[PDB]
């Protein structure tokens, strides 16, 4: 039994994608959108909030059968019970092949007859909180961890019979905090979206794989910035061209499963270049508390990276560097776990003192044998090691997880943000694992 909060988050994400794609379609001149703004978090310092709307629809029906929009509106009203400050502009989106397009007739009576619902799930979830019962027995029954058939029947009978009021201003929610427009199904509108995007030069599959997801994410990221005044937009064609440049600049950070398999195939087929070069300097920035089972799998991942990218004695002349995000300690245990596996690394730390010359030394190698002094550099996310990195720049820098890229100079360095969940995903992205 999965938690309903995850399902609500999934529905909110689907609405966010739908609204973002609608804004992209309507982005012609001076849109100034405020896509979404609630992620069910603690701080709401800057509102920048559209709503936590959902887009649900059944297979095919002229009219809604029964209790279709009951759960979304119940969640909307429950959330509105703790909504204040600036106005939050609620709405509701749906598709119907044969129905009116636009605002539906919703003034007062529809919600009163929705509030007359008698579903056990709805009563246990939102009706009880919206309309508290007037009996202590019902209050005790609702708070019980386990509910029996007799208790559920009694609660249903009490709710259906007894007229229970509420303290939330329902008419205020109706006049302003709700819009119900029947839109179009954006699954079939993917072709139209591609056709509208197919107005510049671009390419056939490039729009499908690189341009459309990048536009969707960049537009969706317009409202996540801490500044609330960054949404100023005018002449949407000019900002569309700017996003056209930005998509080629980034070419990453795709959200959905578009063209992408397993858990995250996102990227790849564009990381293969600069991974087919022998003498290249690749630096990895890893946040340990973002990868599942980091402690027991980092050593194996390092071993399998070095047996592919640091095997050749004459062509592989650059040493990989793995700057983790931990304390100065916890490096001794990694060093111990590498020694037991017969892998030679250097940390640059003797105890707690960092040594500039011990971290910038080049490994002496002997070609008649197959000996290199050390095969990797593994240190922490400290200031001295960042100064070392800036002193000897890399050609590619891979950011795994969320790590502050500041204090790192980026003259001729290619930043490649990689979001992953486990080491199988990272292995698959680096062309060292054919399958998942």
């Amino acid at each position: 039994m999965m938690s309903r909060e995850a399902d609500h988050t999934i529905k909110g994400f689907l609405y966010q994608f739908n609204k973002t794609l609608n804004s992209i379609l309507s982005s012609t001149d001076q849109d100034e959108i405020q896509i979404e703004g609630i992620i069910e978090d603690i701080d709401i310092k800057n509102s920048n909030i559209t709503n936590a709307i959902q887009c649900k629809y059944h297979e095919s029906k002229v009219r809604h059968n029964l209790s279709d929009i009951y759960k979304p509106i119940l969640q909307m009203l429950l959330h509105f019970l703790e909504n204040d400050s600036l106005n939050i502009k609620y709405a509701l989106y749906a598709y119907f092949p044969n129905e009116q397009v636009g605002v539906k007739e919703v003034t007062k009576s529809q919600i009163e007859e929705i509030l007359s619902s008698s579903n056990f799930d709805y009563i246990s979830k939102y009706i009880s909180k919206i309309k508290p019962p007037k009996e202590q027995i019902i209050k005790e029954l609702l708070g019980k961890t386990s509910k029996t058939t007799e208790d559920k029947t009694r609660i249903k009978k009490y709710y259906e019979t007894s007229k229970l009021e509420t303290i939330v201003d329902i008419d205020k929610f109706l006049r302003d905090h709700f819009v119900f427009e029947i839109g179009l199904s954006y699954e079939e509108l993917m072709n139209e979206t591609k056709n509208l995007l197919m107005k510049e030069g671009f390419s056939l599959e490039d729009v499908k794989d690189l341009f459309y997801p990048n536009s969707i994410q960049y537009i969706a990221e317009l409202s996540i910035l801490p500044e609330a005044e960054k949404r100023i937009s005018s002449k949407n064609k000019l900002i569309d061209y700017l996003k056209g440049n930005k998509k080629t600049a980034m070419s990453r950070w795709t959200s959905e499963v578009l063209t992408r398999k397993q858990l995250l195939k996102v990227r790849k087929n564009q990381l293969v270049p600069s991974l087919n070069i022998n003498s290249r300097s690749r630096y990895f920035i890893i946040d340990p508390d973002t990868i599942d089972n980091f402690d027991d799998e980092f050593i194996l991942f390092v071993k399998d990276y070095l047996d592919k990218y640091n095997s050749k004695i004459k062509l592989h002349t650059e040493t990989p560097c793995f700057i983790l995000k931990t304390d100065v300690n916890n490096l001794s245990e990694y060093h111990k776990r590498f020694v037991s596996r017969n892998i030679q690394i250097i940390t640059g730390y003797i105890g707690d003192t960092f040594y500039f010359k011990e971290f910038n030394k080049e490994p002496k190698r002997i070609i008649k044998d197959n000996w290199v002094e050390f095969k990797a550099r593994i240190s922490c996310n400290s200031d001295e090691v960042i100064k070392c990195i800036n002193y000897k720049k890399c050609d590619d820098l891979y950011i795994v997880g969320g790590v502050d890229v500041s204090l790192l100079d980026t003259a001729d360095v290619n930043i490649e943000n990689l979001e992953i969940n486990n080491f199988r995903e990272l292995k698959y992205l680096l062309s060292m694992l054919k399958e998942i």
Binding site: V272, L275, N276, I277, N278, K308, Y309, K312, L315
Partner: protein, 117 residues
């Protein structure tokens, strides 16, 4: 599998050197004139080659095991493209050829096939 490393590379011919006597004697049947070797190129690409000349020499205390091969194509990713313009860099391993690669060479379509041998 692993056979040797490249000494000299040219658009005409590529020279490879066998590691040891043991390796050559283990797979001397596969190292005949007209058979196939593959030479890596980078970290993911391979250059399929066909052997033309073999010259094994032990004058005094100098063990020499040199093959002469010519490229016929490149195995980029999981696909094969013909051509002779990639030129693997010196000191690059030679890996023999497995059955999967050869089967993928003669794939074509699924209807215009003709099993001849």
């Amino acid at each position: 599998m692993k056979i040797g490393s490249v000494i000299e590379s040219s658009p005409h011919s590529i020279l490879v050197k066998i590691d040891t006597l043991k390796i050559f004697e283990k797979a001397k049947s596969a190292l005949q004139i007209g058979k196939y070797l593959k030479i890596q190129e980078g970290n993911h690409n391979f250059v399929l080659c066909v052997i033309q000349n073999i010259k094994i020499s032990t004058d005094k205390d100098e063990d020499i095991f040199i093959l002469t091969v010519q490229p016929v194509g490149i195995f980029k990713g999981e696909e094969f493209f013909q051509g002779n313009s990639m030129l693997p860099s010196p000191t690059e391993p030679v890996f023999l050829v497995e059955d999967d690669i050869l089967n993928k060479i003669f794939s074509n379509e699924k209807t215009k096939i003709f099993h001849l041998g």
